[PDB]
Amino acid sequence: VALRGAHPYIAALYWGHSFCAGSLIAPCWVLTAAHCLQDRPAPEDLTVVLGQERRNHSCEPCQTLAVRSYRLHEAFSPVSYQHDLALLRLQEDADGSCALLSPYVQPVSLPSGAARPSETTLCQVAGWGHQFEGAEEYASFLQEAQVPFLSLERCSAPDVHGSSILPGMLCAGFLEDACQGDSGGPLVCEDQAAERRLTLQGIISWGSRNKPGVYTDVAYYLAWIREHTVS
Ligand SMILES: *[C@@H]1O[C@H](CO)[C@@H](O[C@@H]2O[C@H](CO)[C@@H](O[C@@H]3O[C@H](CO)[C@@H](O)[C@H](O)[C@H]3NC(C)=O)[C@H](O)[C@H]2NC(C)=O)[C@H](O)[C@H]1NC(C)=O
């Protein structure tokens, strides 16, 4: 029995005329890419929607929340895209409550740390993708894709991605498709060094169609994550 949605952890981030995807990791915390927020957008500007099916559409199970604070990695290189992750702190509603777990909204598990994915480890990426301005009624539904994992040996190679792959990045893709997937968005993969079979291995970074995708390697920042969520 399936009493939980597809990708019920996926968060949508709206401010101004800007948009990023994200990953609910606890009911009060969302994890994204750094570069979505370089410009230092004032927390009170941002809107985050959980449990959303189509981009910028409302829906019964959608929960809209305000963001009370965020932060980017100290070492985030706006040039190289290296420490590309930020945390956002949702705003506890009246009565001290962020993101009411439902079939449509549940956090996603962080990686074991001892998640050592081979290249036949199965992985999935989800998002909305490009949508044309205007005409909210012709939105697009959440989409998904199986991507194979890509060892850094094969990814860091120059016919491929070269010295552009720094520490704390990983790749998944086909060498040879990719318009779904939004900045900030989740890559989730089989783990089995956690009780929960599925874990959050990636955040969508850069990479884009004929060349692999590059992701912040979430285990790598696993301490940064706790150091900053335990608050
Ligand atoms: C579709 O995209 C829009 C961006 O183009 C989103 O816009 C945001 O809507 C919010 C309300 O849903 C705003 O917040 C509210 O602001 C006023 C204060 O002036 C108050 O009335 C509300 O209480 C407050 N919300 C609170 C406290 O929770 C945002 O400021 C607004 N931002 C912009 C730039 O327009 C849509 O929400 C988004 N929707 C969906 C469903 O995807």
Numbering used by the authors: 359 to 534, 538 to 569, 574 to 596
What text comes from the article?
FXII circulates in the blood as an 80-kDa single-chain polypeptide zymogen with no detectable enzymatic activity. The FXII Arg353–Val354 peptide bond is cleaved by kallikrein, generating α-FXIIa, which has a heavy chain of 50 kDa, connected to a light chain of 28 kDa by the Cys340–Cys467 disulfide bridge. Subsequent cleavage of α-FXIIa results in loss of the heavy chain and generation of the isolated protease domain termed β-FXIIa, which contains only a nine amino acid peptide heavy chain remnant disulfide bonded to the protease domain. Here, we describe the first crystal structures of the FXII protease domain, which reveals a zymogen-like conformation.
The recombinant proteins investigated were FXIIac, which has the native N-terminus, and a zymogen-like protease FXIIc, in which the N-terminus is blocked by the presence of two additional amino acids, Arg and Ser. Using the recombinant FXIIac protease in crystallization experiments, we followed a similar approach as the FXI protease (FXIac) of cocrystallization with the inhibitors PCK, PPACK, and corn trypsin inhibitor. FXIIac crystallized both in the presence and in the absence of PPACK at 10 °C, and the FXIIac crystal structure was determined by molecular replacement with the structure of the homologous HGFA protease and refined to an R-factor of 0.219 (data collection and refinement statistics are summarized in Table 1). A key feature that identifies the FXIIac structure as a zymogen is the absence of an oxyanion hole (Gly193 and Ser195) and a buried zymogen-like conformation of the Asp194 side chain, whereby it forms hydrogen bonds with the main chain nitrogen of Trp141. A second feature is that residues 182–183 from the 180-loop and residues 217–221 from the 220-loop of the S1 pocket are not visible in the electron density. In one crystal form, the S1 pocket loops are partially flexible, which is typical of a zymogen. The N-terminus is not observed in the FXIIac electron density, and Val16–Leu23 are presumed to be flexible, and do not efficiently insert into the core of the protease domain in this context (see discussion). We have previously observed in the FXI zymogen crystal structure, where there are no crystal packing contacts in the area of the active site, that the 180-loop and 220-loop are also not present in the electron density, suggesting S1 loop flexibility. The FXIIac zymogen conformation was unexpected, but is in agreement with the enzyme kinetic data described above, which showed that FXIIac has reduced catalytic activity as compared with β-FXIIa. The zymogen conformation of FXIIac is unexpected, as protease constructs for u-Pa, FXIa and trypsin lacking a heavy chain remnant have been crystallized in the active conformation.
